[PDB]
A paper describes a structure:
In the present work, we identified [name] ([name]) as the target responsible for the sensitisation of various cancer cell lines to gemcitabine, using reverse-proteomics. [name] is a key enzyme in the nucleoside salvage pathway and recycles bases and nucleosides originating from the degradation of RNA and DNA to achieve the biosynthesis of deoxyribonucleotides, which are required for DNA replication and repair. This cytosolic nucleoside kinase catalyses the 5′-phosphorylation of 2′-deoxycytosine (2′dC), 2′-deoxyadenosine (2′dA) and 2′-deoxyguanosine (2′dG). [name] is also responsible for the initial phosphorylation of numerous anticancer and antiviral nucleoside analogues. [name] adds the first phosphoryl group to nucleosides analogues and is usually the rate-limiting enzyme of the overall process of converting nucleosides to their deoxynucleoside triphosphate form. Hence, [name] is clinically important because of its relationship to both drug resistance and sensitivity. Previous work has revealed that [name] can adopt several distinct conformations, which are a function of the nature of the nucleoside and nucleotide bound.
In order to understand this activation mechanism, we solved crystal structures of [name] in complex with masitinib/[name] and imatinib/[name]. We found that the masitinib pyridine ring mimics a pyrimidine base in the nucleoside binding site, while the rest of the molecule extends to a cavity only available in the ‘open’ conformation of [name]. For both molecules, interactions with [name] mainly involve non-polar interactions, without direct polar interactions. Additionally, for each ligand-bound structure, a supplementary electron density was present at the top of the cavity, likely corresponding to a second molecule of compound interacting weakly with the first one in a similar binding mode as the ‘F-series’ inhibitors reported previously. Moreover, it should be noted that masitinib and imatinib were able to open [name] in situ, since we were able to obtain these 3D structures in the ‘open’ conformation by soaking the protein kinase inhibitors in a ‘closed’ [name] crystal. The binding of these compounds also released the monophosphorylated substrate (2′-deoxycytidine-5′-monophosphate), observed in the ‘closed’ [name] crystal and still present in the other nucleoside binding site subunit, elucidating at the same time its mechanism of action. Furthermore, our structural data revealed that binding of masitinib or imatinib promotes and maintains an open conformation of [name], critical for the release of products and the subsequent nucleoside binding. In contrast, our structures show that TKIs binds partially at the active site, but without strong direct hydrogen bond interactions and without sterically interfering with the catalytic residues.
Residue numbers in the entry:
A (entry chain A): 19 to 60, 72 to 260
B (entry chain B): 21 to 64, 78 to 260
Write the structure that this text describes.
């Protein structure tokens, strides 16, 4: 489509929602599509969404498959509906997504299967499912570049505390670390091999969101806007 | 590309009758229930059908979802078959997506195996699946293979499928009633509005037709002439 698609990636509490908001406000033809999993951190889809997430917190090993499949469905469904937004009849349309279909499977669900929360028959079903739902759409959802909000696992643990979600207070530094490394291996080093080929040659901008960018954000916004010309 | 559904209870006589019809003529093909794709989970062991009967309080959601998505997959694949290339093409589906929700998943939710969250997620999913990908799988006529839950319980034993040799009558009963309330009594209301005016051909399959299937083909040939 005419509408370009950019993915906003990063660790838990790295600064994705703060950045996507700073971008929503800007007077450009940009539409932001939030993470359904973030919308459950607080409708006929939230009712479910909140309950799986609350169940995901309580018993991880039981809900990891139920949750990861409803995350990717509520993401796929959303992102497709965003493409039909006003932007179509807009000049320079850019659609930014809080995370992506690739971040779900490769970074989080994978880590969840590795964490012995999804069994082997559970993982096979998720992988065969994901593979199929992505293949059954096309260039519709294909990313035209990714933005990696790089932050040390320690800034994420202090921002987890900042955010104040009491369910997330328990999250340990090791978990963030384990996530951080899975990000760097895909986005930075690019040693992580996804099923979807096209990702191999996709531009990636890496914004060091370590020091609070909440109010000092003109610097990123420019390095973003230039990144946008190169696509 | 006339799409017919073959509906009925566990071991009522769906494949038997389906495979009698398939042999009968060209331009007639069958889209079986992938109850072996569930039996050996791979990427198109792991017997998601056994784990389900083992502990449904833990596997019913995981199952009905994979059962439904594997169907949508093979049913859609069959429409892109060689049937399109012949006169009078009538494709026969062993059960449907309406069967996977209004009978089996619905019963499991009613039997406490799926908590409300699981059930709501299943409906949310099955609704969006059928709206998007299954916009072409809309049935042209349903054949109901009506058999007592007692007969099914005897055929289940004849079959000797171990995954299900531990099925109580209660279960077969609960399903027999749901198929009656949907296909005979016509009172199981669905999210898919057209279903309301889809012809049904209810055939009693209690008295064995393995070699006495003459009458049933004579009725179905007539049924497919109204369609
Ligand atoms: C919300 C949530 C809350 C708690 C947990 N649980 C854990 O991180 C976790 C807790 C305990 C363990 C330890 N297990 C204990 C039991 N044992 C069987 C195995 C090991 C392993 C993992 C997972 C999550 N799941 C998450 N999903 C996401 C996510 C975001 C975006 C898209 N998809 C998923 C982020 S965090
Ligand atoms: O530069 C930053 C980025 C984020 N935050 C805060 O840190 C928390 C986590 O950030 P965010 O909501 O963006 O989480 P994410 O979407 O990355 O998971 C929130 O309370 C933000 O307001 C902040 O104070 N400064
Ligand atoms: O007229 C019939 C139809 C079936 N069967 C037996 O019933 C079992 C289950 O048959 P089928 O798989 O066709 O039923 P479905 O479960 O597909 O409804 C098998 O062991 C068949 O030999 C039978 O004895 N007589
Ligand atoms: N949506 C569905 C469809 C089928 N089955 C299971 C019940 C039986 O164990 C088996 C019946 O297979 P068939 O009638 O094709 O032999 O499939 C199920 O639990 N849920």
């Amino acid at each position: 489509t005419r509408i370009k698609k950019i993915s906003i990636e990063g660790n838990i509490a790295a600064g994705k929602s703060t950045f996507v908001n700073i971008l929503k406000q800007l007077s450009e033809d940009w539409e932001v599509v939030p993470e359904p999993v973030a919308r459950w951190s607080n409708t006929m889809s939230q009712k479910n969404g909140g309950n799986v997430l609350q169940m995901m917190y309580e018993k991880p090993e039981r809900w990891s498959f139920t949750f990861q499949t409803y995350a990717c469905l509520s993401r796929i469904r959303a992102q497709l509906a965003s493409l039909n937004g006003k932007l179509k009849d807009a000049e320079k349309p850019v659609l930014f997504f809080e995370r992506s279909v690739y971040s779900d499977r490769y970074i989080f669900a994978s880590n969840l299967y590795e964490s012995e929360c999804m069994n082997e028959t559970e993982w096979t079903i998720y992988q065969d499912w994901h593979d199929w739902m992505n293949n059954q759409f096309g260039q519709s959802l294909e990313l035209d570049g990714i933005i990696y909000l790089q932050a040390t696992p320690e800034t994420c643990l202090h921002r987890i505390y900042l955010r104040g979600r009491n369910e997330e207070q328990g999250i340990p530094l090791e978990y963030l670390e384990k996530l951080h490394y899975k990000h760097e291996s895909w986005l930075l080093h690019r040693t992580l091999k996804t099923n979807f080929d096209y990702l191999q040659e996709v531009p990636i901008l890496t914004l060091d969101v370590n020091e609070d960018f909440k109010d000092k954000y003109e610097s990123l916004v420019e390095k973003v806007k230039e990144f946008l010309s190169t696509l």
